[PDB]
Amino acid sequence: CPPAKVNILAQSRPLSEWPINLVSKGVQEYVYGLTAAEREANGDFGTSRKSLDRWFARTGVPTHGYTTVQGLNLILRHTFNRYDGVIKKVETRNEKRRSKAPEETAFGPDGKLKERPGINPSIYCYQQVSPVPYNPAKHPALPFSGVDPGAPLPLGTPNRLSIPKGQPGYVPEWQRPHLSTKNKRIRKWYARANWRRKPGRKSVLDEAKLKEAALKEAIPIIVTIGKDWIVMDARGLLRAVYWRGIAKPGLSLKELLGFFSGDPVLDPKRGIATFTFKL
DNA sequence: ACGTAGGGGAGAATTGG
RNA sequence: CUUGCUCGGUUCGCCGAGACUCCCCUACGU
DNA sequence: CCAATTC
Numbered sequence: 232c233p234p235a236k237v238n239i240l241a242q243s244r245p246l247s248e249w250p251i252n253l254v255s256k257g258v259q260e261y262v263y264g265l266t267a268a269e270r271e272a273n274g275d276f277g278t279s280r281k282s283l284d285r286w287f288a289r290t291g292v293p294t295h296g297y298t299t300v301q302g303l304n305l306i307l308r309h310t311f312n313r314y315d316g317v318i319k320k321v322e323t324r325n326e327k328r329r330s331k332a333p334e335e336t337a338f339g340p341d342g343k344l345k346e347r348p349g350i351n352p353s354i355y356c357y358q359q360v361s362p363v364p365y366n367p368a369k370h371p372a373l374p375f376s377g378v379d380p381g382a383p384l385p386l387g388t389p390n391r392l393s394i395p396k397g398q399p400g401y402v403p404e405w406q407r408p409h410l411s412t413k414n415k416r417i418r419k420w421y422a423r424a425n426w427r428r429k430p431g432r433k434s435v436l437d438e439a440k441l442k443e444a445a446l447k448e449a450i451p452i453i454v455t456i457g458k459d460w461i462v463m464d465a466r467g468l469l470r471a472v473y474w475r476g477i478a479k480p481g482l483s484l485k486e487l488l489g490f491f492s493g494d495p496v497l498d499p500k501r502g503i504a505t506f507t508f509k510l
Numbered sequence: 511a512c513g514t515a516g517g518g519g520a521g522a523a524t525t526g527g
Numbered sequence: 528c529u530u531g532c533u534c535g536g537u538u539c540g541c542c543g544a545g546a547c548u549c550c551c552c553u554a555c556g557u
Numbered sequence: 558c559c560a561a562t563t564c
Contacts, residue, residue, distance in 0.1 A: 234520075234549050238531065280561060300561055309519070316517040317553070323517085349552040351518075358522055359560065387529035401540055411543065418541085419529050425541060434539045448529060466530040473528040474547085480528080496520050498550070503531085505549070507520060 235471035235506045240446060241373055242461045246499035249459055250295035252354050255306040257293045259350050262310045266342035270314060276307050301357040313348040354497040361493035362452035362463065364484050370453050371460055375446045383481035384469065388417050416474065421445050452488060454495065468506060
């Protein structure tokens with residue numbers, strides 16, 4: 232199950248103000264700093280509505296309007312597994328000590344866990360919120376158009392030589408001999424690997440011209456949690472199914488992300504979300 | 511600032527109002 | 528083989544050559 | 558139609 236990465240196009244509000252992130256951060260901030268007696272007392276979290284509904288009342292963790300069951304089970308199983316990770320580490324670090332031969336516990340005089348886990352900013356998606364083809368009617372308004380999910384996707388730049396002179400993608404005459412006779416990736420005109428600062432490049436970088444060219448031919452997929460929608464560029468998905476030999480040139484969007492899981496993992500600060508290959 | 515070293519993590523197929 | 532990314536040619540129009548198991552967090556060397 | 562239940 233190898234990973235594939237996708238760039239983000241637009242979102243209404245940033246991922247910090249998302250209730251799914253705020254609830255996770257609030258839950259994580261409350262749990263890591265708990266004594267070994269508090270984790271067992273407060274570990275009475277189930278996989279049911281009524282179990283989680285009152286768990287916030289007893290523990291007092293803020294709720295920012297997040298009540299979805301599976302979303303809560305993706306930030307409560309994980310938070311207690313990170314908590315157990317430090318104790319298991321010093322217990323597996325106890326295991327190496329045991330092999331060599333009181334102990335090196337993970338609780339100080341205050342009783343708290345001294346090597347407190349850091350807050351994990353990953354926002355884990357679930358089945359009820361999965362990427363779908365961006366339909367202009369159902370989903371909110373965005374400038375970039377959405378493709379039909381049933382029609383096959385276009386093949387990128389066929390017959391590169393047969394491109395008008397003076398129009399983007401033109402291969403000059405002195406350069407047509409000694410071209411790649413073997414198959415490789417076909418980089419686009421607006422590719423940044425052709426336009427970047429190099430001692431030998433006299434060309435001018437203009438980020439406005441290139442980036443606008445990039446999203447007109449984009450492949451948008453959308454994930455909506457509450458009243459927040461994130462829209463992406465499903466071309467890293469397309470390249471992943473191309474350089475790996477699992478796909479052909481003509482392939483529909485509905486079938487493109489069927490290769491991937493319905494649970495993307497987002498990176499709020501880096502601006503990238505990672506897919507995986509469902510097997 | 512950097513290897514390292516070592517804990518966490520990366521669905522989906524029914525069922526019920 | 529439409530994005531992204533590393534290393535090179537270049538007539539600056541784009542070309543050839545690559546990588547693709549990654550993110551988070553706590554620690555310890557230089 | 559889509560969260561809660563479930564492994």
